[PDB]
Each structure stands twice: as structure tokens, then as C-alpha cells.
């Protein structure tokens, strides 16, 4: 079957969890730090704000 998704989907769809600097791997975060001046990856990841 597969009937639902329920409540901790809110901290998995990133509307209540952590910044996109805490849930991303620290390799992709470092790459993003260093590449922001010719390619931007910041507008493709959620930041919850509660």
C-alpha cells in the first residue's frame, strides 16, 4: 500500500528542522562556501524559520 507521511515530515521537508548548513554534508557545505561568486547553490536548499 503506502497510505501517509504524517507529522515528522515537517522536520524532513525542512519547515521545522535545521539550516541548509547543518543537514547537508560538510563537503557540500564547504564547496558552497567557496563557490558563490560564479555559481550559486544557496537558493536550492531550505532554511526553516520558527
Amino acid at each position: 500500500m503506502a497510505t501517509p507521511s504524517m507529522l515528522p515530515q515537517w522536520a524532513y521537508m525542512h519547515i521545522a528542522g535545521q539550516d541548509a548548513s547543518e543537514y547537508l554534508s560538510p563537503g557540500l557545505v564547504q564547496f558552497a562556501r567557496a563557490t558563490d561568486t560564479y555559481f550559486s547553490l544557496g537558493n536550492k536548499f531550505r532554511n526553516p524559520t520558527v
Binding site: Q18, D19, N47, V50
Partner: peptide, 26 residues
């Protein structure tokens, strides 16, 4: 010039997944 200078010189810290910290502690 004509004077104003007041508190809150920088960003007010709040761990930006949320919008708070505390009232202090006691």
C-alpha cells in the same frame, strides 16, 4: 552633526532556525 547614538550596535543573536534565546537566567 546633530546627535543620536544608541544601544544595539550589531545583530541581536537568535539561532536562525528560530527567533529567540532567553530572558537571561535566575
Amino acid at each position: 552633526d546633530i546627535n543620536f547614538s544608541s544601544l544595539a550596535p550589531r545583530h541581536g543573536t537568535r539561532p536562525f532556525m528560530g527567533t529567540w534565546s532567553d530572558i537571561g537566567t535566575s
